[PDB]
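Note to self: the last two entries modelled the partners one at a time, which told us nothing about the interface. This time every component goes in together.
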Amino acid sequence: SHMYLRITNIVESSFFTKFIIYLIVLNGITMGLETSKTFMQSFGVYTTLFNQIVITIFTIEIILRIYVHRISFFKDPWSLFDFFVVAISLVEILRVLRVLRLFRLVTAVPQMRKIVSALISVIPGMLSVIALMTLFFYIFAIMATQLFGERFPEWFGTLGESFYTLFQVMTLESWSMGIVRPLMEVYPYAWVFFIPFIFVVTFVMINLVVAICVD
Amino acid sequence: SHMYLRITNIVESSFFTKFIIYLIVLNGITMGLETSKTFMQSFGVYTTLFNQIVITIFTIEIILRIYVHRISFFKDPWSLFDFFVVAISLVEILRVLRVLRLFRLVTAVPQMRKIVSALISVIPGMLSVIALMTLFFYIFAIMATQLFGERFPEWFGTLGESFYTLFQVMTLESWSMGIVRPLMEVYPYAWVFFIPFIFVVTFVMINLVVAICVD
Amino acid sequence: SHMYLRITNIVESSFFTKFIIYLIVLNGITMGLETSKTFMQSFGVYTTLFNQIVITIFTIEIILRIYVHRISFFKDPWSLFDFFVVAISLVEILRVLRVLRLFRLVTAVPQMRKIVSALISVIPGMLSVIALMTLFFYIFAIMATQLFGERFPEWFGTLGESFYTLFQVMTLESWSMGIVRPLMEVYPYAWVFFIPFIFVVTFVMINLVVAICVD
Amino acid sequence: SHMYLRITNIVESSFFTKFIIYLIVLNGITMGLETSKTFMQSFGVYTTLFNQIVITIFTIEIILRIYVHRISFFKDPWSLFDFFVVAISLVEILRVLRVLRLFRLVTAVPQMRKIVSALISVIPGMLSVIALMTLFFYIFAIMATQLFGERFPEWFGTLGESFYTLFQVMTLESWSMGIVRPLMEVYPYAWVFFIPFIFVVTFVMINLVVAICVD
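The predicted structure of the combined assembly is written out below.
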């Protein structure tokens, strides 16, 4: 505990935290600039290095954090997150998921974690309804696969297509002009299937929204 | 009551219930697989039999349930449901409505029945508004049939077309680009009809949503 | 008060009211049938007479009601309504507005008047916001007339076109694909005008909805 | 304080205020008429002068107001506003922003300032969520720039295009028919990116709406 106590005083420092939060904003701005073809032609090298750096520093940090916190660290969701997203950046999609390190600014900032925590908190109460929904979708996706998939493969060819189309219908997006009117040119009674779907899923959803009152 | 009491102890068992809930999930997964042309080519037979089985077992169950519960059974909405949906599956749409047996997982699970019951419960308070709405639609569907059906048969040819179009307008889906702008190319004052419709029906509806507070 | 008292006992009777409510539903069904070209070919005469009848009966009723109620009658919104809509039906749009007599079923039924009254009641509190809105639209409709009307006459040629388009944008219907993306092909900064419009009008509106709590 | 006190009694008068509110409505109506090509051909001169006048009067007013109120004036948001918008009108966009002087009717009317103040008041509580959102957009806009911008430049070519498209997706406008279905013709897994985006941003937003309860 001679050396370990010297570490723990660093990790707990506000400097360290202020230093990490710093690099987050830096790297965060860096990634918005890596977005420009122009900028990368002129400064892309300076940048890809500056990235290699921060992920170094961040890896050090986690390892430091893990010494100081031992098994407490892996019981911590905010750290687990921090862990997971740095791990990702160690490893061509993975190239893109590296951006999720900017969420570190949520974990790393208590103002923010509060909100996220506050919203995540409400979720459990909502879940039993979420399974109602999903049971509802699955039954309808199934029925819609076999009612309309033969003549309308793009939208209902497969269970997953039906799931997607039904999601879209639930958002009400182009549901009549784009989906149900076309359908009725072949299945005049398609409205018997989709109007009640909309009544239900967009009456549960309003009700599912309301469970937002916890926050 | 010698034999009848021996039955009732089976039907009340948690095994029986756990056994029925089981087959529901099984058959439920089965129907998602009956969705695949590939899967049915290779295992469609094993499946259509496995279905014949479960509906047997379920029919037995209801009959058992009916002995144990006598006239209490047909006073029970959850059982009435269970009844109705098994009956359906006994009897080419009926082929498709057989999927409604997966809702048995709502009746059969108390976690779920609570929610459904909880939401169904709110409905009565909402009804008097629902008749307001429907009176509103009917009056407008009528007026819109005779204002626009001649030049716009697809959308307003018939009272039912007008009902459907007005429903669609109520969801705000393509109401301007798809319906009212086209209409105004012939009836420049069509906005006098549809803007107030939207104000009302989408002010009742927000208000109809709010009666969700009971739950 | 010899004769007048004999009348008043009729008008107050539940028979009279039950009799009027009756004809409303009758005529109401009649108008849904006047919707069919087929039905009018076969029974259109029997119908147009049956209409002439009811409006007679209704005119009698109002006149009766007016004797019994004198200046109390014209202080009554439900009767004023009843008055206004029967007057209309006495007098080719007027032909169509005659359908508004089916709203008599709202006045004539207390279950219903309650709701309408209940919703109308909330409106006053909401009004000061409604003038905010309208001031907002007018300022923006003006600014949008003169920013985009020259190159986009259909949508912004006129103040009223701009009012209509902005209403449509407020409902979010096709606002990006149909309006603002097209606009940006000429006015790359059009989003500076429309995103804040949507933020405001669809933050007031949510807030205007909330004043629904009175009911 | 001999002369200064004589002024202050004018500025505090209800006449002055009633006089300024007057010109606002006048000029306000004037600008709706400056909208018509016809009207300007016949009366555009009388009008452009009448405008020069009011902005004179208004400039006088502010200067008066500033004498009476000294450094209190520039600490006042309603006056700062009044200031800013008259300044604008002193100075071809600026030509158009001159319409913002009609908002003077919000400052100048206490009925109105209350509402605005009341709504502005709620904003602070909402802000920490607004930064969550914006952090969310930026991360996704970035990821979407580099996932889809090459094959879909119009919508995702640039970080700002992605910001705009993601805003549009958040409003749910044409998100499936117009954006994500097209995308899936090339990137079959695009739904893995956009469905969760919609779940989050349209679960925060409902929650962000709810903070409306302060008012």
